[PDB]
Amino acid sequence: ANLISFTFKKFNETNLILQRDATVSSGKLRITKAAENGVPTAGSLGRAFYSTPIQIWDNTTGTVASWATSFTFNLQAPNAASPADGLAFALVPVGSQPKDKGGFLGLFDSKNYASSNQTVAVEFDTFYNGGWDPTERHIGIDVNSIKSIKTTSWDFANGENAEVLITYDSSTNLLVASLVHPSQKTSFIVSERVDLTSVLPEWVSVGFSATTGLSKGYVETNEVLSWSFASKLSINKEDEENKLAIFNLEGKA
């Protein structure tokens, strides 16, 4: 079985694919631009991916990979009544380019079924777009669209750390995403079956995508403070389930 793993408790530029306004400042993945005075800037778009393409399914064997990612992010808005737009963990083609800004989070073009994009994303959305979004702040699973196929409620804590875990079991074809705010003892979880064989390509770039608002006032920081990732691809049998107990302790702590 082929495996690929990494742990970034501190960020570096050389092993990441930085796109647009994404930059590594003082060990922190600052996806959206900030001023030298500490002010978030509007109309920003940033993308950061791992330098190694990751195999999530094989053509010649028909086997799906089991993979898991963890990360801690912090979204800091000067005003909590005017934030936009949010950040996402995405899997995208090897040389895929940034798309529409703002509510599309640099990942999608529209709310309809766009199979050509070939992108699966777990979004952490802090702006109500109406055209697709639920009423309050939410975590969503995005399949070839910004209109999430499933969502859950996210009681967002302004400027507090958010510890995330995203797991995909190939045998049950289930994508599970959870968010905990350690400062407020709050917990949130999403789970939905997604088949990666027909949605995503064999090789993908794994990383982050974030935007700010299309208006001057709707601004936030979109920093990623830590990020661990693991994947296991089976040889011939469908797949064996991954180990999650030793995943978060060796990576997140």
Next chain:
Amino acid sequence: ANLISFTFKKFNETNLILQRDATVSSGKLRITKAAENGVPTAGSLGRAFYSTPIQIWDNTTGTVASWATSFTFNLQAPNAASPADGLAFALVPVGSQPKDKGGFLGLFDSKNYASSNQTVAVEFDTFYNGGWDPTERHIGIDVNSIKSIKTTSWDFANGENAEVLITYDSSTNLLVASLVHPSQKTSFIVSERVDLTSVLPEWVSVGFSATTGLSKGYVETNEVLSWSFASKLSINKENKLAIFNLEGKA
């Protein structure tokens, strides 16, 4: 830092401390009793704990361990009109013997706070008990009491595999517990701060405890199919959750 980890994708009697009715049958941990034909027995208790004691906190240095556990369990009742009582993952003292059965889940004696227990449990309760339980099915965090300090609703599906992950971050004192039913794509989560230095002893045994109903009809199978665990205790002054569920569970 000292580490301790294991993965039980198939169970063995040799490396577990079996208590009461808990037994290993065809590589699957049956915590409560069941007939050769497949029907669960009423009024049963079982406990299964790992062989080596795990250090959660060191008194002299003050350092507290970060740990994570993943397991898949199967609760199957002949009739959903009468299910009892439930199963729990718990941390207990070294020489901990089974306590009161039934609603107390073999881990507690009374509804009031008793420091003599020194038990931290994550319960997966399916029966609506008396002066301690919330209205529906629930996950709970038990601390020296059967009355959970915090609960979350859990839509339980009969005879369907539940994927559990429990995590304890030392630096933030946060105990998080999650349950996913992959068959119907349902997920549930709870999080609460627990001071394990005040509650647990320095060395603990980790594992399971389950009970069937005290009445003759209220019966269920309390099975655990897989179980992976890891712990990390520092030396002088977080755990990798990504690689945990893969190598072990995932």
Next chain:
Amino acid sequence: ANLISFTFKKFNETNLILQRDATVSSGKLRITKAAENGVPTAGSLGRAFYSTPIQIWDNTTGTVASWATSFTFNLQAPNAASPADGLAFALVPVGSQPKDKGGFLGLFDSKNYASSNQTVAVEFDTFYNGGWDPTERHIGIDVNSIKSIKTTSWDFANGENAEVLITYDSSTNLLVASLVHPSQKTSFIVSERVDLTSVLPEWVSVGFSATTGLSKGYVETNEVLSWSFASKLSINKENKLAIFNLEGKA
């Protein structure tokens, strides 16, 4: 796939089975007697094992487990001219007791292959017993016999740390034991095809056994400073070695 892993950097008395003179003090595992002055004592015998039994071959599935260990040991002798006897990493029946004191290392009875004991050991010999030992200080593989099945020449560095790595694979069966002395920048390696189904029972306890001289001036310390171990039993019909050494090594 069943897994079991742990790493030591500082030792404790709770997560180990301690036999005879085996003592834990200041976080270091002292297998043989060291007086309240810092002086080693002759005639001492000790055994230290992990409290969890480890499966090395399963009968019903017909597969042999692949394991690996890594430990830093220090042999501090007041006189290099009279050193006895050494230490060994061993796989032994779960509740098995130490045997002959001295050159037999508290593991074996005689120089002949006796599979009533069922003990596989990797010795680090620092005394010349001659009847079964080569000329000088040596690292050997012991299978049911104190007379090693294979040995390699070992430049024993007195009072210096020795970082060992022992590996066993299922596909190749090549038991490979390597020792490095970082201070002297030296390295030595042993390799022989051993099959565990012919020797050890389904379940064993892994750990260490060390002895001092049968004389009165033959004194040395047999300390273990760190200890890692990982094992994997392949279900149905190769284990990683790189991702292990850094956990406890890298």
Next chain:
Amino acid sequence: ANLISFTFKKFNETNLILQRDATVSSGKLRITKAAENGVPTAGSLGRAFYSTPIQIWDNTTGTVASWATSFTFNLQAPNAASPADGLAFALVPVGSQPKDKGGFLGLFDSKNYASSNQTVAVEFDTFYNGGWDPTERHIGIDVNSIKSIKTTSWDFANGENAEVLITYDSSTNLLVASLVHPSQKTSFIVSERVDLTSVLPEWVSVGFSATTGLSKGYVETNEVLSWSFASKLSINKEDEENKLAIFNLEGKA
């Protein structure tokens, strides 16, 4: 602790960098341009590497990283009297190109010490030069030059499957390289302490540097069956050893 690891049991081109005369195909890693008939070509330079650069030491803390690797590499030559030249586990800089062919192993320009090369490699020599080499076959460490300071003796097994383990410890600066034969039992080991903060830079491309001779007579093949790697960076003045037992079972075993 910044972590990075991967285990190949089945190689792919999509996650492999190629330099000069490298090629990735047919269920193995043929580093040199081999013909259809299985013919070793002389006057070549193969270079296969992993996409992510790997950190050796930090600047903001000054902490050296411990790493470990394991691979099953093969050297096969028709004539026993003419083996040339071999391969080396290259830690070549990211922004660096291949150099001289032959006895230089595509790593260094001259036999003299030069800190501009910034490369440390584990040599697997087969040809007799002697100007910067011992009297026979040798496995050692190259420091800022093709000339070695300490090497071991090795029996050149003609086309034998051999599992290798190369490990590094930051605390004692020791590089331990072992080579075992599952069929022949001929095990060999070498270790030497060299400071890497003085020699190597922060980030390097990690893989294999392989070369052939100048004459058609002196030829051999270079193949890799399975390859594994792990690396750990310490945080604040640890000077500690990394786990080694948990790694070797992931790929090899």
